[PDB]
Amino acid sequence: MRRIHFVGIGGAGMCGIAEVLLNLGYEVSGSDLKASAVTERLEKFGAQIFIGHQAENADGADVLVVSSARANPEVASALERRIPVVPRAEMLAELMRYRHGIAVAGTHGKTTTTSLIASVFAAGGLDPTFVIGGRLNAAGTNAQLGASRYLVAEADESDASFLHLQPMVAVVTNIDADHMATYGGDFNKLKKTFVEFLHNLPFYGLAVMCVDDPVVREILPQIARPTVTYGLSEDADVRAINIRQEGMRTWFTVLRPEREPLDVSVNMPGLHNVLNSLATIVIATDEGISDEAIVQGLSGFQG
Amino acid sequence: MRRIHFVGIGGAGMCGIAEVLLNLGYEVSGSDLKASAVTERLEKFGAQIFIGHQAENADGADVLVVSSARANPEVASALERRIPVVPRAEMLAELMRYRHGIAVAGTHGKTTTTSLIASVFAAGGLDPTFVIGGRLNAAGTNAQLGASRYLVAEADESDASFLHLQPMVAVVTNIDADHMATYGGDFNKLKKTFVEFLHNLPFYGLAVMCVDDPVVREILPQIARPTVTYGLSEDADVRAINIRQEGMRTWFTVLRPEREPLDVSVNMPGLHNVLNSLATIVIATDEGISDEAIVQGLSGFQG
Amino acid sequence: MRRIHFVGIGGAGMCGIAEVLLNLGYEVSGSDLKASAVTERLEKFGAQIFIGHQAENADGADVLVVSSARANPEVASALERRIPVVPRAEMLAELMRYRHGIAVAGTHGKTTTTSLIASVFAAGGLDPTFVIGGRLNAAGTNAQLGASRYLVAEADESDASFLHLQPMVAVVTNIDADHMATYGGDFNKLKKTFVEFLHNLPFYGLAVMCVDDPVVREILPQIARPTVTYGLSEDADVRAINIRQEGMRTWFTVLRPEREPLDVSVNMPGLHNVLNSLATIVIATDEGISDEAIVQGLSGFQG
Amino acid sequence: MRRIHFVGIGGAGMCGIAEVLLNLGYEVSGSDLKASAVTERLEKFGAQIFIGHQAENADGADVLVVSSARANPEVASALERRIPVVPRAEMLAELMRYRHGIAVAGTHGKTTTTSLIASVFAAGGLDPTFVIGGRLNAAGTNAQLGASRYLVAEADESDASFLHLQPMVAVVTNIDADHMATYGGDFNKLKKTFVEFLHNLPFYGLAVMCVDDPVVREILPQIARPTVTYGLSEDADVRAINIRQEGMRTWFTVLRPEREPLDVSVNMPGLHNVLNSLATIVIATDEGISDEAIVQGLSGFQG
Numbered sequence A, B, C, D: 001m002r003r004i005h006f007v008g009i010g011g012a013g014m015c016g017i018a019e020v021l022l023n024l025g026y027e028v029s030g031s032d033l034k035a036s037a038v039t040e041r042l043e044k045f046g047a048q049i050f051i052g053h054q055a056e057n058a059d060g061a062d063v064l065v066v067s068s069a070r071a072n073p074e075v076a077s078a079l080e081r082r083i084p085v086v087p088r089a090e091m092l093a094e095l096m097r098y099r100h101g102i103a104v105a106g107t108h109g110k111t112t113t114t115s116l117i118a119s120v121f122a123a124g125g126l127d128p129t130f131v132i133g134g135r136l137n138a139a140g141t142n143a144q145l146g147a148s149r150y151l152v153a154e155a156d157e158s159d160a161s162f163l164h165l166q167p168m169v170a171v172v173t174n175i176d177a178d179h180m181a182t183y184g185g186d187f188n189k190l191k192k193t194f195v196e197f198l199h200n201l202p203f204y205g206l207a208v209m210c211v212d213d214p215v216v217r218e219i220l221p222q223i224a225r226p227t228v229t230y231g232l233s234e235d236a237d238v239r240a241i242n243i244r245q246e247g248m249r250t251w252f253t254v255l256r257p258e259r260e261p262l263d264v265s266v267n268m269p270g271l272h273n274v275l276n277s278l279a280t281i282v283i284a285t286d287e288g289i290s291d292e293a294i295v296q297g298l299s300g301f302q303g
């Protein structure tokens, strides 16, 4: 397959995916009801844009991507012609197969942790593409989305594509019951899904686990993958101690195996943001990012 | 992770995996009770071999691989130091991430279809590594296992690693009830697992589906991946007609989209071996392999 | 080789090379007489910085890079231990082996053509790294130098590394006599060097030749590589017609094989800048860049 | 460029090159006066074969390869259409760009040293493709030529493509005056060409230098590339001592930096074959090949 066709390519969750696929070297086409600066930018980058929906817009497409949600003549034409029609969320999840993917999973804290990771990686000069709220970003980037080696993405356990993400590194911030309905209303089935998620890591991958959560601590011995734990717990690999405040800024000292203690600060209050920073610190440490870029990335994040 | 340690590296299912990891560039060590030509070959290829089991043999290992079978001192030492221990079957499934993987799934016909695929690819000069019965082979190869771009492997729905295979192409020969116990004794759960398996294909991947099976035909509209169907069914993409016998040899004409009809023969009787050949023909055609190599591989496979 | 050591890493021509090697994944160290924001940025990205020159700074280095120009104790230590010491210009030329290299050669017009190419590639979202005056740039980049797939570099026939560049695409704007002394004061030897330079392209490479120059036209039949010619000559593949001025802006229509005529403008006068733009248009066209990015890149270049 | 057309593809020096290009994924066509088993094998592997020479055989070709030397209508058609026509030897030299290239240079000993290297790499399971006498081989291979990661080739200083080889590792066995005519009949110009040859290595490359030759010893300080020296000289990095005979077999002890002494034997007499063996040992050691494979590769080479 070489040509991907987006139905509604100007949508806020669609244009970013099309831009990465252009960056990856694919032929990209898309239709929309109105030309916009979004479709003009995509066209400048090589996308073929159709205004209006008609069956012929899907001619030649190898796969269709359709908006979160079917009588549409492009879709109907693709089905009758046995062209696969994939939902937006699946194509988004698939982008991780082309990059060094960092999946930020857990029921709470994904958005902040993803942003903190992006901020530290940016401070180290790596310009990562990142996914928050289903939207691809690259902060102040001067390039097509997806240009960086790194893709940092929220992994939502309620998303149909959860068990199809192929990350190199995965965080589990915590395991709550918000999305029990996704798994038959059974919290134990939800827990097993996190184990299966972590087993999509390759044996050389890394699982970053918050052991302050008793549910994470419970599934920890089932993860037959390399693991680094973090939290305030005395037995966490990467720990925060001596937590203090100076204004709206929280300071703490981070302990890491075989490293000197490092003082960091973060511009947001609450232990949950200390934990989000610890997760970030584990990932940046494992990736080899300097202490200065870590301090700069955490300290400069607004919110 | 860089050093993989095999406990019982001389085993028939272990030595092949160790050889591929050596071919992939990893540090490989392994212990065994007896030195043999198998451990000498692994040592010639760069493995570090220990005879006898003692805890120190696992020093420095980043991951342990243990036989489909825990009091062992190397295992106990690895657990105490939080080194992941993965079963033989899981490391085997993981090899597909490094290669152009062809997963031959289905309840019946996996062994023959894999062998025919290997035989056709071999005839085209591609020397594939292939997995039948959990043993890695490359036929008459003059090289380390895994040297080819291609890895062709049986994908068994009863294997715990089934949903962790990451193939480029997947066959489903048929869906039977043999392994219902793996899925709570529920055939409908078993069917859903084949759908989830096919969704591990990337959007550019290929699903090769035998539509003569009513169960395969049922799940076909759920496969949101590129698909080629085969069988004797009049509506299959790739079909066999004019089936005849001349000795113990079965002849038939294969019809393929946008190709002229091609006469082939196979040295085994029964419509099930026609179907095994059709699956092979679909995969070889999609890979660009010549008619000559297809004819030669199929006719030259003994049994 | 894994550790590269720069003697005088803070210099304006050294820091850029060190940053790209960091981006490529190498261990990079460097010494300098004074810490500066340049060395602090390099340290943030993973460089090990030494202040002051002492023999031990070179310990562990696999290669040393020294500034354009031996009594230095780091150099002397490396020579005594048979570590290679490569000049800045050679390490710079070597960066092209890791990227899609575009070598802008010719006696005149290298700086402007390199800048125009970078500007058009930037407009297409490709954020190229480019080398003008021996200095690596990525204009308004949010990343380490070298992050882009593309490296656009002046290729100076007076540089000792000229015949060691390994580009994917090479321009020859013109062949003048400025640097005859490099070649024994013999213009015919200088012409032969341009032929040998173009033969460092791979057979899949591209030579972009300005046939308005009679010297380029002379060596053209000797280039056994894919070639696209440009200029005002009636027989050029890519030509400029209908040249006009409106202010300090020059307008013209570009003819390209199998394309519709395209109107462009450039914010600098003179036929030499029409030619610089034609070279840029040939490279952008062959790389697949849209007409809109070409028009925007050329029109937005100040000077 | 994607389609390469061979004029005389069945010739002994052409078919091997076409097979590697097929293995690399290119479209390959070729013409010849007679069908043979050689053209049938190429056709089985995906080559398009034309019988007879007519201009139309060159249609669609991006480059033509012609045997070791124009009235041919395919050549004339290509020249008239500005399709590059490259000689067999230049395309052969270019294959090294796709592989881990080992260039065996020096006036004497190239054929034996190449065969010994290939023999040792084969014993280590690497099935290398190698070039002796302008012919591509892979010994008893079950695969297309070029399938291995490694390409081992004689580098002849009289070959027009000498300074266009892009090896990762280069041997210089000795520098004699046989080919002074290639270099204006000036031995000093010949010496300088070997220096330029070694500078085509990248800074991470390796030069393997026989310092028993005083000419090699003379140019050694000009090689600003990683270097390992070998020979009987007391100051060589890798040395042979205790040379003895047992039958028609020559035994000696090889000393290597930071390794225990290793006894090896070879089936051919003369110090020149000790030197050919030392060169092989340097390359195999640097590539990480086990002592067992070295001993087996050297001991099993017939002659």
Ligand SMILES: Cn1nc(Nc2nc(N[C@@H](COC(=O)NCCN)c3ccccc3)nc3[nH]ncc23)cc1C(C)(C)C
Pocket (backbone or CB within 6 Å): A108, A109, A110, A112, A113, A172, A173, A174, A175, A176, A210, A213, A214, A215, A270, A271, A272, A273, A275, A276, A279
């Ligand atoms: C923006 N933001 N960022 C967060 N980040 C994390 N929050 C949690 N935990 C939550 C409590 O949630 C559980 O403990 N629920 C599972 C019980 N099995 C929490 C709340 C307060 C203090 C400490 C912990 N742990 C984490 N570890 N690493 C990262 C991380 C949390 C939030 C909001 C709740 C404000 C949305």
Ligand SMILES: Cn1nc(Nc2nc(N[C@@H](COC(=O)NCCN)c3ccccc3)nc3[nH]ncc23)cc1C(C)(C)C
Pocket (backbone or CB within 6 Å): B107, B108, B109, B110, B112, B113, B172, B173, B174, B175, B176, B210, B213, B214, B215, B216, B270, B271, B272, B273, B275, B276, B279
């Ligand atoms: C060695 N070998 N190779 C085989 N190959 C295939 N056998 C089947 N089918 C089985 C019947 O099994 C079902 O149909 N069961 C599922 C019902 N939902 C079958 C049996 C006889 C004739 C036709 C089909 N279909 C296929 N398609 N492509 C490949 C393939 C089969 C076997 C043995 C049974 C001898 C072990």
Ligand SMILES: Cn1nc(Nc2nc(N[C@@H](COC(=O)NCCN)c3ccccc3)nc3[nH]ncc23)cc1C(C)(C)C
Pocket (backbone or CB within 6 Å): C108, C109, C110, C112, C113, C172, C173, C174, C175, C176, C210, C213, C214, C215, C216, C270, C271, C272, C273, C275, C276, C279
């Ligand atoms: C900034 N800038 N940019 C330039 N760009 C190019 N200038 C030339 N030619 C030079 C004349 O130089 C020769 O023709 N000398 C070789 C004779 N064998 C030229 C001068 C005036 C008008 C037209 C051509 N041709 C080219 N082709 N593509 C690009 C290109 C030139 C210059 C300066 C001279 C102002 C430094």
Ligand SMILES: Cn1nc(Nc2nc(N[C@@H](COC(=O)NCCN)c3ccccc3)nc3[nH]ncc23)cc1C(C)(C)C
Pocket (backbone or CB within 6 Å): D108, D109, D110, D112, D113, D172, D173, D174, D175, D176, D210, D213, D214, D215, D216, D270, D271, D272, D273, D275, D276, D279
């Ligand atoms: C098959 N075969 N294999 C060979 N291998 C090597 N032969 C040489 N040397 C040649 C003498 O040649 C010079 O010394 N000429 C340069 C003077 N500046 C030589 C001859 C006899 C004993 C020792 C050295 N040195 C080497 N180093 N590594 C490899 C290597 C040589 C030969 C034949 C001559 C029989 C063709």
